Design a protein around this nucleic acid. Structure first.
Lengths: 269, 52, 204, 159, 169
RNA sequence: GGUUGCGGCCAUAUCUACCAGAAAGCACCGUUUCCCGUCCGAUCAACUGUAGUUAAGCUGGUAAGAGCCUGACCGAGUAGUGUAGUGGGUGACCAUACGCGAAACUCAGGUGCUGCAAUCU
RNA sequence: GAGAACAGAAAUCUCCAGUAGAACAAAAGGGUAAAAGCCCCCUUGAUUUUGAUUUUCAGUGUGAAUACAAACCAUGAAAGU
RNA sequence: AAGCUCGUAUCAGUUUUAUGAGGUAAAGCGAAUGAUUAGAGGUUCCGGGGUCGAAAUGACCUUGACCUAUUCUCAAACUUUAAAUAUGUAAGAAGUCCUUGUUACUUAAUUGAACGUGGACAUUUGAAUGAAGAGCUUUUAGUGGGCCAUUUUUGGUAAGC
């Protein structure tokens, strides 16, 4: 193009060129009642890549955001989940994980236990009587389009069942009836564990057997049938109560051997 | 029709006076939500300093 | 009817050009601004004689016309139409108001004018070195028409260009110069190499 | 007739700086504001809700209130032969802290710290500022820089 | 050569413009149901003129998009309606093309009496895999010059497939 | 050092034309049983990461490139301007004294820096 | 701009570019691009109580606006508005 | 005019340092929006002609537009940029630091917020000059036709307009 176009062009912000943010929404989340002067405004950031889930507790400062705690789907094998890592179930598990991580990184894991026996009900985390208040965070789904049944409201549910008071309304959880404006909790509890995957597996296991294995080639490794997912995911839910703390990997190198190779691939000037 | 000659001279004769700012200004335009708690705070401070 | 030009001479008011705010304006009497061998290269006519001002006044679109005519009727009739290139620099855009009638003393446009400052070219004549005695006289018969002290100048620049004679020859001896219809295209030492070499292949 | 409105004569005044249209950068809603703070005013025509009047453009004032999405400032205004206090409520996009105080407070820190230092040293110091005093004596060398004589230049050969 | 570089088709649009509205458009809409299995969409008008007698918000044209192997099938049975002969002018810049036909029963449909004869436009578009990025919400972007379909690649693919007749006139 | 998520400053980051990219990662690519959404599982939702791949995307380079940023013995202490005179000039305008002082051209250089967490031969 | 039968300068359809050159009830200016513009869904904050403040301004009114408090509501998954 | 409270405070038609706002002059238009002269290199299935032509989505002259780099000159109601003068604010005692008491506001919170106690700093008490005293109140007279000059400047041809 010509020069008059470029010399009077305006570059949008870097992350709006990259497409990874919405400032019209960030201005609504980050900003706070000024009489609440320097207090933070905590967001449950949640993102669904092609094969991994990210969850984060994010505060906002001037020179970038600040991460209190975060969770990724690729450590759930520490508790027992090995396949179906981008799932409504894995989202609920990771929400419970991040919640139970933060609620002892702050020191409230005893007062607010959340719900220990899920039944798929819309229940908001109340405050204790004459004690600390729940951890009040909010939620921002990226550029995602909210639709009922989404993978992300599973994480919302796991969070609120962990205890950290994410306000929400049931009309985007699945099993909500547009007609009568009510919810079916049993369908929701089915989707918590394997209800949209186990049913499909035990459908194809007598409809089309070869294709069932072509897709679920991994669920036949340790001999997981399409009924053990309940006792698997609840054992995950309980181990997360047992030991939600983050314990990082062990590195084969020390951040200089890592850099030495890329320093002879990066194609300097 | 609006000959504004000799107005600044009249102004500067008797002086252009600043408003004489005070300590403890008026709390009329402030947040009532804060005003009430400030009120209830000062009485507690007075009760705490009467004994002490 | 017309006013005398000794009324609208000096830069008194601020300029009031033609636009949507001032749409209906009578058109100028000068329309031509270029005469002689227009389609003639910079190589033919090296020498440039200007006609500079010495005051700050207004020039009328009919004065420019009757000066151009009496400067072109001499050169063309004594040397030849293809001997020179004459260019009028200034253009009349200012507009002049008249109270043809003080309740509602606004004025209706009837003429145009050209704003000049202390040091400003009006006429620029491009010729060879063997035609300056004619050029100077042809501009002498023009300084009589429009008012003021106007001094004729013999430039150091080549033609209507910006470079002096020997600097321009330095540039021409290499491939740093290409011709246009009647102007030039200098070769920068910056830009896209491929396009820079496509044109000006005599260089390098 | 003549018009005296609320945004008259604000054509070149409230239009954004060139190549700065669009959303406001988030560091406007995160620079926190307390009472007693001192601020300047610059209004942006992208946020029509919370504007000042054109008289309060470029002015400077002190804060006296803090609410959601907005603050309130005290500004002294000339009219007739006295100054009137004006308590006006603005949003935060139209506000920037004034560095006149953030450059003063560091000098407070510096002179306080050096009054604590000299009070440990055993010296009596000066910490009032002073203007640019005149230049002192010096000896100017001629070892490499011999003076180059000069003369003015004529009119001809320049023209 | 390369997987995810072949000029795979993505969709085909069966546009029909009539010029007027009424039962005519419904008889233009009860025809594509069998030819596609999907409902058409009735396109609304845009401007005004006396020659064609149209006004805004009026339905004069109808079309349907179709993807998957159904577009391939329909094009295979609709190109021997043309004897597989296509002209270079029918190929656009970006390597997508199309063509008109007049007899909408030339495909072999069980002729409905109540509709008659009206033609049918086709315009098929293709794109090498990985063109999602121009459509998705998060992290949009364009595709490189090494990945853009053109007349050159499309006539190659259309000579390699369909076994002949691209009239390079 | 590379990468992801969230980002701050918002072109030194953009734009055009090519080239290269181990590692993981990101991404594309596989299927529609389910919530859901579309005229069109194209987008969007969900499922497996299982089947294939860097060609795109993405990152990094290259261009005596366009554009942008920085800077001065470039232009220029010029144009303009506050003050002064029983200064000049028919006047327009101009000069000088005290002071401030640009822009455009020109030339040279630069072509993202970084913040929290996680991860990579 | 390149393309598709009837189809043209133009009806409908598809692709590339596209910093606004469009539209925003109304004059002009300003402002606005995952919106303040187009389409759709839900809606009545176009509501009650009185106050504080800005503008023209004697710092009187009237008109129009700005930011809060006590209530009730909508809308949104939510911050929020 | 009457005075009242006070006694060099903290004010000032002032400068300096620091820190902000403007869109006037100037400059620019081979940068946007408009106005504008010139020829050159170009493009047509597409503005009109002439020629070869049965006719061509056919060839050559030709002329305007669109394309491209160039060129002459402008804008009070165009502008990337952007001065001079004038203008807003701060330069401490009603201050700084430490300690930590109150509350029905606020915080995930013994969180910050506002106001505080008790300590330390009080001498160059935090730029210059000067200060014929600073502050405050009441009451009322006359006026409420203006004019001349330097500079800026609008109508007007111009005026002791």
């Amino acid at each position: 193009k010509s020069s008059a176009y470029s010399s009077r062009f305006q570059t949008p912000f870097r992350r709006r060129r990259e497409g990874k943010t919405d400032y019209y929404q960030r201005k609504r989340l980050v900003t706070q009642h000024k009489a609440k002067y320097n207090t933070p405004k905590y967001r449950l950031v949640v993102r669904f890549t092609n094969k991994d889930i990210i969850c984060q507790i994010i505060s906002s400062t001037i020179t970038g955001d600040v991460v209190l705690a975060a969770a990724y789907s690729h450590e759930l094998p520490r508790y027992g989940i090995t396949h179906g890592l981008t799932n409504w179930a894995a989202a609920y598990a990771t929400g419970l994980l991040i919640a139970r991580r933060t609620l002892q990184k702050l020191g409230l894991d005893e007062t607010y236990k959340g719900v220990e026996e899920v039944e798929g009900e819309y229940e908001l985390t109340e405050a204790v009587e004459d004690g600390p208040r729940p951890f009040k965070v909010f939620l921002d789904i990226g550029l995602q389009r909210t639709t009922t049944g989404a993978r992300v409201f599973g994480a919302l549910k796991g969070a609120s069942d962990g205890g950290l008071y994410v306000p929400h309304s049931e009309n985007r959880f699945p099993g909500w009836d547009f007609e009568t404006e009510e919810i079916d909790p049993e369908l929701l509890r089915s989707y918590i564990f394997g209800g949209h995957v186990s049913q499909y597996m035990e459908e194809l296991a007598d409809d089309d057997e070869e294709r069932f294995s072509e897709l679920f080639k991994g669920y036949l490794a340790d001999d997981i049938d399409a009924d053990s997912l309940e006792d698997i995911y609840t054992s995950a839910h309980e181990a997360i109560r047992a030991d939600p703390a983050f314990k990082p990997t062990e590195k084969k190198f020390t951040k200089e051997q890592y850099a030495a190779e890329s320093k002879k691939y990066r194609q300097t000037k | 029709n609006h000959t504004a000659h000799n107005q600044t001279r009249k102004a500067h004769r008797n002086g252009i006076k600043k408003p004489k700012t005070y300590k403890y200004p008026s709390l009329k335009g402030v947040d009532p939500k804060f005003r009430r708690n400030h009120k209830h705070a000062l009485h507690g401070t007075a009760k705490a300093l009467a004994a002490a | 009817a017309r006013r005398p030009a000794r009324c609208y001479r000096y830069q008194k008011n601020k300029p009031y050009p033609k636009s949507r705010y001032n749409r209906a304006v009578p058109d100028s009497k000068i329309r031509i601004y270029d005469l002689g061998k227009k389609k003639a290269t910079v190589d033919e006519f090296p020498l440039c004689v200007h006609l500079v001002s010495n005051e700050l006044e207004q020039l009328s679109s009919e004065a420019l016309e009757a000066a151009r005519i009496c400067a072109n009727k001499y050169m063309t009739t004594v040397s030849g139409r293809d001997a020179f290139h004459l260019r009028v620099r200034v253009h009349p855009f200012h507009v002049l108001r008249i109270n043809k009638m003080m309740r509602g003393a606004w004025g209706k446009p009837h003429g145009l004018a050209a704003r000049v400052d202390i040091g400003q070219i009006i006429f620029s004549v491009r010729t060879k070195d063997s035609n300056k005695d004619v050029v100077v006289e042809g501009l002498r018969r023009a300084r009589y028409k429009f008012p003021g002290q106007q001094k004729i100048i013999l430039s150091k620049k080549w033609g209507f260009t910006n470079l002096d004679r020997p600097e321009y020859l330095k540039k021409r001896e290499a491939g740093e110069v290409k011709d246009d219809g009647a102007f030039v295209k200098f070769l920068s030492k910056k830009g896209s190499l491929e396009n820079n070499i496509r044109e000006f292949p005599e260089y390098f | 007739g003549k018009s005296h409105g609320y945004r008259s004569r604000t054509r070149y005044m409230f239009q954004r700086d060139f190549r700065k249209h669009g959303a406001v950068h988030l560091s406007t809603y995160l620079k926190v504001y307390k009472v007693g703070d001192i601020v300047d005013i610059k209004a942006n025509g992208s946020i029509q809700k919370g504007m000042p009047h054109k008289f309060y453009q470029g002015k400077t004032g002190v804060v006296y209130n803090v609410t959601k999405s907005s603050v309130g400032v005290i500004i002294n205004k000339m009219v007739g032969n006295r100054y009137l206090e004006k308590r006006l409520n603005l949003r935060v996009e139209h506000i920037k802290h004034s560095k006149c105080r953030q450059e003063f407070l560091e000098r407070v820190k510096a002179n306080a710290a050096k009054r604590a230092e000299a009070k440990a040293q055993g010296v009596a110091v000066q910490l009032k500022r002073q203007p640019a005093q005149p230049r002192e004596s010096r000896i100017v060398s001629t070892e490499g820089n011999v003076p180059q004589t000069l003369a003015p230049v004529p009119y001809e050969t320049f023209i | 050569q390369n997987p995810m570089r072949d000029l795979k088709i993505e969709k085909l649009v069966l546009n029909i413009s009539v010029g007027e509205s009424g039962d005519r458009l419904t008889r233009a809409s009860k025809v594509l149901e069998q030819l596609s299995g999907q409902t058409p969409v009735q396109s609304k008008a845009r401007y005004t003129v006396r020659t064609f007698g149209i006004r805004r918000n009026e339905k004069i044209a109808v079309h349907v998009t179709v993807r998957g192997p159904k577009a391939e099938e329909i094009l295979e049975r609709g190109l021997k309606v043309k004897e597989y002969q296509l002209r270079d002018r029918n190929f656009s810049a970006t390597g997508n093309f199309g063509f008109g036909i007049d007899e909408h029963i030339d495909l072999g449909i069980k002729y409905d009496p109540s509709i008659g004869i009206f033609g049918m436009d086709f315009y098929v578009v293709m794109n090498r895999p990985g063109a999602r990025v121009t459509r998705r919400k998060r992290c949009k972007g364009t595709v490189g010059n090494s990945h853009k379909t053109t007349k050159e690649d499309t006539v190659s693919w259309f000579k390699q497939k369909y076994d002949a007749d691209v009239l390079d006139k």
